[PDB]
Design a binder for this molecule. Structure first.
Ligand SMILES: *Cc1c(COP(=O)(O)O)cnc(C)c1O
Ligand SMILES: *Cc1c(COP(=O)(O)O)cnc(C)c1O
Ligand code: NA
Lengths: 406, 406
C-alpha cells in the first residue's frame, strides 16, 4: 500500500521487548507512543556533541543550539500548516498548553456572566483548566452532550451558543471513543457568534494531516510523546492576531524585554513572551526528529494502514462473546470496550499476563464513563507499528478470559 | 585530593568537541551544564527498552515506569535532605517552580497592602513572578540592596521586614557574582516575623551539599540541566505543612481525584496535585542518573576541586591588564568581569574565536548590572570538569584581546 509495517517496526527498539516472558504487544500508544531510534538518537547526539544553553548566547554552541530550536519551531509550524513559525509556543504538553490559554487568554476575555462550551467526551486536560477559569471569573461551563454511538449531539448547539459565549474548547479526536469531531463546521458556527475555538488535537496529529488554516481554529494543542517523540514537550498554536494581544503567563528570564525594580518590567514579543526560563531543548530536538520521521513515512500512508488495521480488528472482535464496544464505527486509533460483567482492571491484568499492554480505568474522561454508566473501560490502541498478529493476540486473549472467568 | 578531573572529563563526550578548529574550553556551565554519558545513556536506554506512560497503568511497562519516576522523587528528596519524597514536585525548571509558588501559595497568602522581599542580585526568574503577584494582589516588592563587593547590605533588613512582610525570596548563590548568601540566618529572621522563605538554589546544588532541613527554608527550587542533567526538568521542594494546604496551579489529568461536569472537581493529594498531565518521564529518568553521578563523585570532593580551581583562576587573572571583577573574593562557580572599556559582547566574541565559551550580556540580572553601572558583563564558569589549562587559555585570551583592541 506504500507503507511497510515491518520496515517501520524495525526502527522501534522497544517492540523487541519481552513482557512476562512473552513478546510485547504494545496496544497503549494512545497513552504514550514508542519512539523510533531516529528520535532517541537525535536527542542523545545533541547532548553528546552540540549541547549548550540557548537564548542566543555569544559562543558557537549556544548560537547553533538556538538556531536548531527555532528551526524545530518552523518545522512544527509547517507540519500543522500554521501561517507563521511565530504562532507556535513550546509547552510541556497538551495539558500545559490548555492551561496557558485558560490563564493568559481566558482571564482577559471571559468575564462574570459569560459562558464557555466544552463537550461530554473531553479529556480532563480540556475540562479542569476551564472549570478553574469559570470559578475565577464567575462564568458558566456548558456541555455538548453525547449520543449513544459516541458522537456529539450537535442539535443542542443552538441552546448552548448565545451572546455571552466566549469560547468553544473541543477535542479533535476522542482519546477513548476515537470519534473525530466536525471541527470545521463547529468553528464556523462558533465564529458567527464571535466565540473563539481551542482544539485539543492530542489524538489527531499522529493519524492524518492536520491543517490549522483550513480548520480556522483559534488555538490548537498537541503533545510530542504521543507523536512518537520525547516526553516533556508539546506545541500550542495560536493565531497571530490573538497571540500578539495575549499577556504573558509564566514570568522569568528570556520572556522580558527590560526588568527594573523601580520602573517595572516590559515583555518581549510573542511567541518568546510565553517561554520563561531555559526551554526543554533536548525534548525540542527530539520533537523535530519525530516530525521529520512521521513526515517521511507520510501521514496519508499512516492513515491508510491504520484504517485497514482498525477495520480488521473490528471485524475480528465480532467473534468475542459478550464484548461491548463504545464509540462510532468510523473510529480512529483506539477501541474502547468492556468484556461481559468483568472489571476492566481484571481484563487488562489478564491481557498484561499475556504480554499485551492495554489501558484500563477512566482514561482521564470521567464524564464520558459516567455517560456510559460504567466506572471504567479497557482501551486498545492500534497505531502505525501495530500488526494483524497483535490484533489476533488481543482477540484470542479476550476469548480466553471470557472462558476462564465466566 | 580524591577527585580526578581527568577521570571526570572522560565521562563528558562534548568536552572532546572542537570549535572554530580549536579544542573547546566550555566555561559556560552556569548557563547550562554538559552531561555525562551515564545521564545521556540512562535516558536513551529508558526510551529504548522500558518506555510507557506512567500514572500507574495496569500493564508491566507502565507500572515499572511509574515506580522509576517515584524512585527518582525519593532520590531527589534524599539529595537535598528533605524529610519526605512527598515534599518534592517535578517542574520544568527553577523558573516554573517559582511561578508555581507565586500563583498557588502567593495568591492565597499575599494580600493588598502586604510586602514581599527580594534582593538586588536576583535572577529574573526570582523577580518577575513576584512582580506579577504584587500587581495581581496589590502588594509591594521590596529589595535588599547590594554592597560594592557583591554581598547583600544586611543592615537594611530591619527597614524591610515588618508586620506586613509575607515572603522573602532569595538566591542561595548568585549566578553572576558567585556570592553565597547567609540563608540560615536570614531564614531565622524571616521566620521571627512569620514570613516564609523561598530559596532560589539553581546555582548552589552542583557546588556543595544542600540540606533543606538545616536551612529550614519553606520552598527550595533548582534545575536539572545545571546539575549535569537533561533539560526540561527541575525540582520544587515545599515543607509538607505548607504544601498540603496549597491549591493546585495547573489543572488536568492525574492531579484530580474526581471530575464531574455537574458536581465539580476534587483534587488529589500533594505532591501529585501539582503535576498535571503526562510528566517529562525521560527527563526524570535522566535527572535520577545525574543525581546518582554527582553523589558518587561526592559534593565535598567537587567543592574542594572547584575551590582550588577558582583560587588558581583568580590568582592568574591578576596578570590581565585593566580587568574589572565583580563580586566577593570567596565566590562560588562563576567569575564576572569586564575588560577595559571593551563591550562584553566583543570580548566574548574573541574568546569564542579562540574556542573558549563564556557568557556575555546581562545574565538575566538587569538590576544587578544597573547596580554596577554597566550594560553587560562577561562571565566564566569554572565547573568540576574544567581545568587549569582552560583557565590559562582564558587568561592568555584576555591578554591578547587587551593588546589587539587597545
Ligand atoms: C493525552 C491527552 C491529553 C493530555 O496530554 P498530555 O501530554 O498528558 O498533557 C489531552 N487530550 C487528549 C485527547 C489526550 O489524548
Ligand atoms: C538558571 C537560573 C535560574 C533559572 O533556571 P531555569 O532552568 O532557566 O528555569 C534561576 N535562578 C538562578 C540563580 C539561575 O542561575
Ligand atoms: Na507551567
Amino acid at each position: 500500500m506504500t507503507f511497510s509495517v515491518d520496515k517501520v517496526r524495525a526502527d522501534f527498539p522497544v517492540l523487541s521487548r519481552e513482557v512476562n516472558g512473552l513478546p510485547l504487544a504494545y496496544l497503549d500508544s494512545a497513552a504514550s507512543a514508542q519512539k523510533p531510534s531516529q528520535v532517541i538518537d537525535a536527542e542523545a547526539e545533541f547532548y553528546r556533541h552540540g549541547y549548550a544553553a540557548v537564548h542566543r548566547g555569544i559562543h558557537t554552541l549556544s548560537a547553533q543550539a538556538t538556531e536548531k530550536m527555532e528551526n524545530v519551531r518552523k518545522r512544527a509550524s509547517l507540519f500543522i500548516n500554521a501561517r507563521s513559525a511565530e504562532e507556535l509556543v513550546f509547552v510541556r504538553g497538551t495539558t500545559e498548553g490548555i492551561n496557558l490559554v485558560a490563564n493568559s487568554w481566558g482571564n482577559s476575555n471571559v468575564r462574570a456572566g459569560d459562558n464557555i462550551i466544552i463537550s461530554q467526551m473531553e479529556h480532563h486536560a480540556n475540562i479542569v483548566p476551564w472549570q478553574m477559569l469559570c470559578a475565577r471569573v464567575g462564568a458558566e461551563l456548558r456541555v455538548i452532550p453525547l449520543n449513544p454511538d459516541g458522537t456529539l449531539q450537535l442539535e443542542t448547539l443552538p441552546t448552548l451558543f448565545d451572546e455571552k459565549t466566549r469560547l468553544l474548547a473541543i477535542t479533535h479526536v476522542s482519546n477513548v471513543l476515537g470519534t473525530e469531531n466536525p471541527l470545521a463546521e463547529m468553528i464556523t458556527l462558533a465564529h458567527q457568534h464571535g466565540a473563539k475555538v481551542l482544539v485539543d488535537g492530542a489524538q489527531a496529529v499522529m493519524h492524518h494531516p492536520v491543517d490549522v488554516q483550513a480548520l480556522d481554529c483559534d488555538f490548537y494543542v498537541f503533545s510530542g510523546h504521543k507523536l512518537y517523540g520525547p516526553t516533556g514537550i508539546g506545541i500550542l498554536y495560536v493565531k497571530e492576531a490573538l497571540l500578539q494581544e495575549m499577556p504573558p503567563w509564566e514570568g522569568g528570564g528570556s520572556m522580558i524585554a527590560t526588568v527594573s525594580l523601580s520602573e517595572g518590567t516590559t515583555w518581549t514579543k510573542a511567541p518568546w513572551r510565553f517561554e520563561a526560563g531555559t526551554p526543554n531543548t533536548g525534548g525540542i530536538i527530539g520533537l523535530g526528529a519525530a516530525l521529520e520521521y512521521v513526515s517521511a513515512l507520510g501521514l496519508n500512508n499512516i492513515a491508510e494502514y491504520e484504517q485497514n488495521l482498525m477495520h480488521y480488528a473490528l471485524s475480528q472482535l465480532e467473534s468475542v462473546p459478550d464484548l461491548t464496544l463504545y464509540g462510532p464505527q468510523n473510529r480512529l486509533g483506539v477501541i474502547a470496550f468492556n468484556l461481559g460483567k468483568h472489571h476492566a482492571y481484571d481484563v487488562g491484568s489478564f491481557l498484561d499476563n499475556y504480554g499485551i499492554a492495554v489501558r484500563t480505568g477512566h482514561h482521564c474522561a470521567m464524564p464520558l464513563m459516567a455517560y456510559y454508566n460504567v466506572p471504567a473501560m479497557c482501551r486498545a490502541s492500534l497505531a502505525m507499528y501495530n500488526t494483524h498478529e497483535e490484533v489476533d493476540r488481543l482477540v484470542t486473549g479476550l476469548q480466553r478470559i471470557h472462558r476462564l472467568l465466566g
